[PDB]
């Protein structure tokens, strides 16, 4: 996440760009995940859970949440 502060760019603005760049890159997330060894089985299981939850939630929202709530 390289940033160079442009001419007449405020510092706060520069900081904002830097943070955005880092978030987009996903550096913190990568480091956190690589902090400890996740077993392959654990990684697979987590992936499966994420996929299932995401799919179920999407289905519930779009199709199940098409009714009169009140």
């Amino acid at each position: 996440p390289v940033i160079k502060v442009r001419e007449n760019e405020p510092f706060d603005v520069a900081l904002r760009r830097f943070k955005r760049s880092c978030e987009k890159a996903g550096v913190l997330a990568e480091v956190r995940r690589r902090e400890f060894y996740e077993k392959p089985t654990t990684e697979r299981k987590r992936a499966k859970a994420s996929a299932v939850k995401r799919h179920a939630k999407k289905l519930a929202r779009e199709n199940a949440r098409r009714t009169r709530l009140y």
Partner: protein, 117 residues
């Protein structure tokens, strides 16, 4: 005794501690400071505020060298990662470039085992 005007601020921001190190553009270190040496231990040195005061201390230390421009290289996942740069700017350097140099492997060495807490 020497003057350089333009330095690099290497902000090593681990979870436990923040190390700030001002250096010449080549790599040679001028002054450093940590939250530990800044007077914070444990829960207090693992905070953004501690990082900020460490940064202030570092700036004071390298005041002899008369550094005016400064590019900051942030490393690691840390509570500071922002406080240090804010503090440095307040201490009054022109921040020119801000770069992240956190070392991610390309699936290399095995990490240590997961903590059971």
């Amino acid at each position: 005794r020497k003057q350089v005007s333009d330095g690099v601020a290497h902000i090593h921001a681990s979870f436990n501690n923040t190390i700030v190190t001002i250096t010449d553009r080549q790599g040679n270190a001028l002054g450093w400071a940590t939250a530990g040496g800044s007077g914070f231990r444990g829960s207090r040195k693992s905070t953004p505020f501690a990082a900020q005061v460490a940064a202030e201390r570092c700036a004071d230390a390298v005041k002899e060298y008369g550094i005016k421009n400064l590019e900051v290289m942030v490393k690691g996942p840390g509570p500071g990662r922002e406080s240090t740069i804010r503090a440095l700017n307040a201490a009054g350097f022109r921040i020119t470039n801000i770069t992240d140099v956190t070392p991610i492997p390309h699936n290399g060495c095995r990490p240590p085992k997961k903590r059971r807490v």
